[PDB]
Swiss-Prot record, chain A:
Induction: By maltose. Involved in the transport of maltose and maltodextrins. It is found in: Cell outer membrane. Belongs to the porin LamB (TC 1.B.3) family. Residues 1-28 form the signal peptide. This is Maltoporin. It comes from Escherichia coli O6:H1 (strain CFT073 / ATCC 700928 / UPEC). Homotrimer formed of three 18-stranded antiparallel beta-barrels, containing three independent channels.
Swiss-Prot record, chain B:
The lineage of its organism: Bacteria, Pseudomonadati, Pseudomonadota, Gammaproteobacteria, Enterobacterales. HAMAP family: SecA (MF_01382). It catalyses: ATP + H2O + cellular proteinSide 1 = ADP + phosphate + cellular proteinSide 2. This is Protein translocase subunit SecA. It is a peripheral membrane protein. The gene is secA.
Amino acid sequence: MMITLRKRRKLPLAVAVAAGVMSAQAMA
Amino acid sequence: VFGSRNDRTLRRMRKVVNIINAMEPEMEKLSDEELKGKTAEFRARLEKGEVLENLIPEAFAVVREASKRVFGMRHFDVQLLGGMVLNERCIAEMRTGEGKTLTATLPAYLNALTGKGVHVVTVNDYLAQRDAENNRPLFEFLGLTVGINLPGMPAPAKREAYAADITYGTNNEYGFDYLRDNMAFSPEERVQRKLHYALVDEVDSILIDEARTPLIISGPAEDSSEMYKRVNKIIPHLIRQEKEDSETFQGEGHFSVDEKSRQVNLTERGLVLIEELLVKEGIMDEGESLYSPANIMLMHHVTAALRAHALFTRDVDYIVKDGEVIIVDEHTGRTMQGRRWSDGLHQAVEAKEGVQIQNENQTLASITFQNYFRLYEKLAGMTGTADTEAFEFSSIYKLDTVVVPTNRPMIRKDLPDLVYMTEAEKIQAIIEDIKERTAKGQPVLVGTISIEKSELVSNELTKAGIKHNVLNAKFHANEAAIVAQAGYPAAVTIATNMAGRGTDIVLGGSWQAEVAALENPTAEQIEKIKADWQVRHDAVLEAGGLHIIGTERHESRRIDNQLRGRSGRQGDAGSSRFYLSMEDALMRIFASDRVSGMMRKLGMKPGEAIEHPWVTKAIANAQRKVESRNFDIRKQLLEYDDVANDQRRAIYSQRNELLDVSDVSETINSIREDVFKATIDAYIPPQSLEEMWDIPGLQERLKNDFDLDLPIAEWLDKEPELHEETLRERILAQSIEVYQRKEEVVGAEMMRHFEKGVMLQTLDSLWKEHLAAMDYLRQGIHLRGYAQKDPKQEYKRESFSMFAAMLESLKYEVISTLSKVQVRMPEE
């Protein structure tokens, strides 16, 4: 069958560094 | 306001002062409780239909009356003028001795009647708490409330002080409070009230020097930002020679002999190496460029990993032992275990090796004093007799400069500058001027700004045989002892760079300090000393008042005038004499000392007073020119500051709205459709063809960022009449349906609170980024400002695009996160 492989699992870790300074969290 | 500024303002204020003086006898007939009743009356009248500026005649009269019963000091007419001007948005110049506390009490009471809160800005906590408790029995006597705000004060106490009629506090805490207030999640968390009126004690420092002082809050979340290690993880896939990883390179760079370019720099002018980092993996792989204002944050992050590879070599440039990062100095062989290179440099290193990545230390929240006081409606303050940069008040804060007359006629004999050739001539001339006055019984205050000259003149004075006392700042007790008799006849006091204002030196000495040195000063002793002191005071008057001598002048006339204004306290007697040599560094402020050398042919004649007033005028001209040059620089810097200021003001306004309001469904839904449309338009172009629609890409995105599994390929397969618009709406409708279904499980009120919080959180998260991004571009724009284009204008352009992109990213993640939430939904 047609196996459409894609890198949907992108790593936003580089961007998370900016929000890392004030990374607040709620229930999830 | 109406009436010509300054000129007409002076007589206009006098008109009101006359009324106050006439109504004073009437106020003296009013009981204490009646004065209190008038204060409450003004409050009612204000809401009835009375203008604050029209209440001045009665208000100031009450203050004058109350002060005579509380302190016993009547507010002078000159103080009424200044206090009245302080009601507007102008700066009033107050001479040393007039009485700042006896003037600032007038505008405070007047504006306090509005109940909005008078924000008094003090230079330090000492004066803040001093005047707060001192003026408390005055304001509270009329019914007004006095609140004190100290740096570090708990929120509960702050709210009580801020809810008061008059609030005393420091500029430092004032700004931080504003930041904490604006960065709140609930409106009840607030500590501030309203920026209606602000009265700063000293504008000379707080408004001029502290103008470009940004209150940077470095409050990280700590934890473990291992996210950075995932970025540097792509570097080991490259080789330092070609394909991204390359120390400068530029085609050649250097020979193959440890070509590690530790001078940093960085360039990549090939635009073929950076192409290896971009694309693939995820993020910055969609098709975005790294040299765009919408990707400046990552640009300063990826380069960090690069400048942490061949730039910083392990064991030589730095050493990490057991997780402890220590900087190794190759210059002198020193180890810095309590230091780390900022700008995320240390973080890149800690992310390169197996070290625990920290949360960095950058701008979590920041605001400039200039950008803070500009938010206040009525901004007034007192300035000293410095002037100089006073002209910038109208350009920086847009305030009008007004001068206040002295209580008494200033009999300060200002003499010209005696410029000599060598320092020997200058110093000797000073000794002679002093020696002559030592016989006349005139106190001499030498204001040496240079320690080298302080000891020099001291040695010379001893050589000639003249009594002198040096104010050594290392012994405050010694200074206080000398200051007590600094106005004593024939007392030569040498000051080494004295700060602004200074102690109020009374001519003849200070009987207070004399009686305080006695065990038991009986009435007889006090009267006797006062009698002697009186003679001593009159003696100094006949001598010529306090004689000030300036060995060297200062570039900025602000400090120069500060020294000149030391004499003539509240309009007393004195004499100012300044000296200068061709060897002093001050002769270099005239563009070049070669030009000033023309004065070397003036004759000089050591011992003869050439007395040339044009010399002083020439120096004063250059003195103001120095600051004129600085003004241009300040303006250029403020140019970039205001850019971030407006953006901050704009985003803060939106954040404030979402903070005050309880419901945000309107905003959430309005942006929901926009976010979906924008996301759809990225895969499906409007009015295009079916084969031009990336169904898989859109489906994957929906099942990734929106947590919505929609078989669009199946929909269009069976429903061809979907066309395009209906298809877009279908997706949106299905999203709203599932959204509400998720909502019911969490709770209506809870979801509204969640959305409200998420919006604020996402806004703040991007704000932290934007704060750093603005800086990255601020310094980076230097390499972007090409020829045939202004670097400031282009910067503003890029900054606007950055803000727009930030807004788009804001709505994007807000809606996405609200959908990404995995809510436990039961079988419906």
